[PDB]
């Protein structure tokens, strides 16, 4: 279900500064945190999410 196009949802699981957030904090199951981080890492390629907050 979790999906690199869905940049609404992916914003809950990054910072102000566009760092991926750890499962520790968010409470998320670790299967899905793998899928999340992979989603986010594609999103950043396509320029839908940012790497940083310099721009």
């Amino acid at each position: 279900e979790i999906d690199y196009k869905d940049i609404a949802t992916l914003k809950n699981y990054i910072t102000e500064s566009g760092k991926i957030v750890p499962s520790r904090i968010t409470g998320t199951r670790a299967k899905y945190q793998r899928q999340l981080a992979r989603a986010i890492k594609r999103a950043r390629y396509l320029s839908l999410l940012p790497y940083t907050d310099r721009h």
Partner: protein, 56 residues
């Protein structure tokens, strides 16, 4: 770790928010860390040492 001062705010609240925005990012943790090369054998050892300790 970017911040502005919005209008009718003190200086001293913005300088506080700067610091609680930077300890939340861990800029300085992430810079202490790369001062010196740590061999991977040492990285794994310190990791273990923390995990075994934090059983308390």
């Amino acid at each position: 770790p970017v911040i502005k001062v919005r209008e009718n705010e003190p200086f001293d609240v913005a300088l506080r928010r700067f610091k609680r925005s930077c300890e939340k990012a861990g800029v300085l943790a992430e810079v202490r860390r790369r001062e010196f090369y740590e061999k991977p054998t040492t990285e794994r050892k310190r990791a273990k040492a923390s995990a075994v300790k934090r059983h308390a």
